[PDB]
Design a protein around this motif. Structure first.
Motif, PDB file in Angstrom:
ATOM      1  N   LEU A 173     -65.696 -35.746  15.051  1.00 13.03           N
ATOM      2  CA  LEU A 173     -66.864 -34.849  14.961  1.00 13.03           C
ATOM      3  C   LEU A 173     -67.496 -34.696  13.564  1.00 13.03           C
ATOM      4  CD1 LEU A 173     -68.558 -33.269  16.783  1.00 13.03           C
ATOM      5  CD2 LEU A 173     -66.694 -31.708  17.165  1.00 13.03           C
ATOM      6  N   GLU A 174     -66.528 -34.360  12.721  1.00 16.23           N
ATOM      7  CA  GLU A 174     -66.685 -34.200  11.290  1.00 16.23           C
ATOM      8  C   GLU A 174     -67.244 -35.457  10.641  1.00 16.23           C
ATOM      9  OE1 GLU A 174     -65.175 -31.084   9.146  1.00 16.23           O
ATOM     10  OE2 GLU A 174     -63.499 -32.339   8.377  1.00 16.23           O
ATOM     11  N   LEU A 177     -71.207 -36.166  11.403  1.00 14.14           N
ATOM     12  CA  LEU A 177     -71.802 -35.123  10.587  1.00 14.14           C
ATOM     13  C   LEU A 177     -71.583 -35.212   9.060  1.00 14.14           C
ATOM     14  CD1 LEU A 177     -71.207 -31.804  12.355  1.00 14.14           C
ATOM     15  CD2 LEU A 177     -69.858 -32.139  10.196  1.00 14.14           C
ATOM     16  N   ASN A 178     -70.730 -36.122   8.633  1.00 11.35           N
ATOM     17  CA  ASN A 178     -70.432 -36.433   7.230  1.00 11.35           C
ATOM     18  C   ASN A 178     -71.050 -37.775   6.788  1.00 11.35           C
ATOM     19  OD1 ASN A 178     -67.484 -35.684   5.278  1.00 11.35           O
ATOM     20  ND2 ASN A 178     -68.328 -34.214   6.729  1.00 11.35           N
ATOM     21  N   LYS A 179     -71.506 -38.670   7.681  1.00  9.85           N
ATOM     22  CA  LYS A 179     -71.970 -40.007   7.288  1.00  9.85           C
ATOM     23  C   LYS A 179     -73.201 -39.999   6.354  1.00  9.85           C
ATOM     24  CE  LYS A 179     -74.121 -43.455   8.523  1.00  9.85           C
ATOM     25  NZ  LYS A 179     -75.331 -44.222   8.100  1.00  9.85           N
ATOM     26  N   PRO A 180     -73.358 -41.071   5.518  1.00  8.47           N
ATOM     27  CA  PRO A 180     -74.551 -41.369   4.727  1.00  8.47           C
ATOM     28  C   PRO A 180     -75.794 -41.115   5.526  1.00  8.47           C
ATOM     29  CG  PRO A 180     -72.964 -42.870   4.028  1.00  8.47           C
ATOM     30  CD  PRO A 180     -72.362 -42.123   5.185  1.00  8.47           C
ATOM     31  N   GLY A 181     -76.789 -40.517   4.921  1.00  9.97           N
ATOM     32  CA  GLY A 181     -78.129 -40.388   5.505  1.00  9.97           C
ATOM     33  C   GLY A 181     -78.374 -39.968   6.961  1.00  9.97           C
ATOM     34  N   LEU A 182     -77.540 -39.061   7.451  1.00 10.66           N
ATOM     35  CA  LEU A 182     -77.690 -38.490   8.787  1.00 10.66           C
ATOM     36  C   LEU A 182     -79.080 -37.840   8.874  1.00 10.66           C
ATOM     37  CD1 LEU A 182     -75.197 -35.691   9.820  1.00 10.66           C
ATOM     38  CD2 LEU A 182     -77.037 -36.385  11.239  1.00 10.66           C
ATOM     39  N   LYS A 183     -79.701 -37.810  10.056  1.00 11.68           N
ATOM     40  CA  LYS A 183     -81.041 -37.204  10.219  1.00 11.68           C
ATOM     41  C   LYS A 183     -81.100 -36.064  11.280  1.00 11.68           C
ATOM     42  CE  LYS A 183     -85.328 -40.302  11.155  1.00 11.68           C
ATOM     43  NZ  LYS A 183     -85.417 -40.619  12.612  1.00 11.68           N
ATOM     44  N   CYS A 206     -66.731 -25.802  16.323  1.00  9.22           N
ATOM     45  CA  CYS A 206     -67.999 -26.324  16.876  1.00  9.22           C
ATOM     46  C   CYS A 206     -69.107 -25.483  16.330  1.00  9.22           C
ATOM     47  CB  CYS A 206     -68.056 -26.246  18.419  1.00  9.22           C
ATOM     48  SG  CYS A 206     -67.648 -27.789  19.278  1.00  9.22           S
ATOM     49  N   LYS A 207     -68.815 -24.211  16.533  1.00 11.27           N
ATOM     50  CA  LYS A 207     -69.701 -23.170  16.108  1.00 11.27           C
ATOM     51  C   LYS A 207     -69.927 -23.194  14.611  1.00 11.27           C
ATOM     52  CE  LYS A 207     -68.269 -19.643  18.653  1.00 11.27           C
ATOM     53  NZ  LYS A 207     -68.608 -18.297  19.187  1.00 11.27           N
ATOM     54  N   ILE A 211     -72.549 -26.735  16.684  1.00 13.69           N
ATOM     55  CA  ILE A 211     -72.344 -27.575  17.841  1.00 13.69           C
ATOM     56  C   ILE A 211     -71.998 -26.762  19.099  1.00 13.69           C
ATOM     57  CG2 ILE A 211     -70.692 -29.404  18.471  1.00 13.69           C
ATOM     58  CD1 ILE A 211     -71.049 -30.195  15.414  1.00 13.69           C
ATOM     59  N   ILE A 212     -72.857 -26.832  20.108  1.00  9.25           N
ATOM     60  CA  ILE A 212     -72.716 -25.996  21.300  1.00  9.25           C
ATOM     61  C   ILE A 212     -71.743 -26.586  22.343  1.00  9.25           C
ATOM     62  CG2 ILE A 212     -75.070 -25.012  20.965  1.00  9.25           C
ATOM     63  CD1 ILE A 212     -76.210 -26.527  23.183  1.00  9.25           C
TER      64      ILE A 212
END
Length: 308
Positions: A173-174, A177-183, A206-207, A211-212
């Motif tokens: 999950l992490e 959400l941690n990768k280079p250049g996420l949009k 999540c919260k 993240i729902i």
């Protein structure tokens, strides 16, 4: 954070309905005329539906939605549809095919959510689970961040209103959400949760990253269930659960719902029987005291009734 009203904030400033419906393997009696069962769903308010490539209902679920935008019940903006990118189709240069293959078949204009159904990626082809002649499956290394790069593109491409993950845990999950250049960041994480594996740890995570946690097997499924081995635990027949749902009257499906809703989680109900889709519109005519909530936020084993 409390839910129980019809709609909710989702990352993208886009709003999900709070209680949803699911589609898959069926009842012998009446059998696979699923169109009819999705019709006793939108004729009730039920506006958010969840399907996949894999347990394709799409062609004939798409159509019942695409019949109520004909009765004059629905008007599109009012219909929220989850579909899923499949493990085979995970290789980046081709993602969008699964989406089109998802949209032609639904006859819907686009989709509202598209999600990563698995990190488990297998090779491209015609059989949705290619075991390597035998053994396990031929799997090939494509990348999770990469499929997510290949997911965002499509929102930005107007083809599917929002994006999200599924069956990811705190480690996969992490990373997303941690990768280079996420949009476009993740919305839901359709993991399985319910009173016997109700991830208090995914909820207090999540919260944190908005993240729902949308959940399947919320009411335990139990009928037939193609994974039953243990001669023991039928939860919507459980001790406590068949008590509290007399202390607030009517049998424990509605409490199975109620709790999760009340934690601020977006559940998925499956059905086909009219009857059990109707006891569930009642899930808002009830209430839950905190002592009880904790007498419910207790049942957990940690047994995943569905397994990889």
């Amino acid at each position: 954070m409390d839910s129980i009203s019809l709609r909710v904030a989702l990352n993208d400033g886009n709003f999900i309905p709070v209680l949803g419906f699911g589609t898959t393997v069926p009842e012998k009696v009446a059998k696979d005329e699923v169109i009819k069962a999705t019709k006793i769903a939108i004729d009730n308010g039920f506006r958010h539906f969840d399907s996949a490539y894999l347990y394709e209902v799409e062609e004939e679920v798409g159509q019942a939605i695409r019949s109520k935008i004909e009765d004059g019940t629905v008007k599109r903006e009012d219909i929220f549809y989850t579909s899923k990118l499949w493990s085979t189709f995970h290789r980046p240069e081709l993602v969008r095919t699964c989406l089109e293959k998802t949209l032609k078949s639904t006859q819907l204009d686009y989709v509202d959510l598209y999600i990563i159904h698995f990190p488990m990626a297998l090779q491209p082809g015609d059989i949705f689970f290619p075991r390597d002649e035998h053994g396990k499956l031929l799997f090939e290394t494509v990348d999770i961040c990469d499929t997510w790069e290949a997911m965002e593109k499509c929102k930005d491409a107007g083809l599917a209103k929002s994006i999200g993950v599924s069956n990811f845990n705190c480690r996969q999950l992490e990373r997303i959400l941690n990768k280079p250049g996420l949009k476009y960041k993740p919305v839901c994480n359709q993991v399985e949760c319910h009173l016997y594996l109700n991830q208090s740890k995914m909820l207090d995570y999540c919260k944190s990253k908005d993240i729902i946690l949308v959940s399947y097997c919320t009411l335990g499924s139990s009928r037939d269930k193609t994974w039953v081995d243990q001669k023991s635990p039928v939860l919507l027949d459980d001790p406590v659960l068949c008590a509290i749902a007399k202390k607030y009257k009517q049998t424990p499906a509605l409490v199975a719902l109620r709790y999760q809703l009340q934690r601020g989680v977006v559940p998925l109900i499956r059905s086909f029987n009219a009857k059990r889709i109707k006891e569930l519109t009642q899930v808002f005519e009830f209430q839950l005291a905190s002592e009880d909530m904790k007498a419910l936020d207790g049942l957990n084993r940690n047994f995943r009734y569905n397994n990889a």
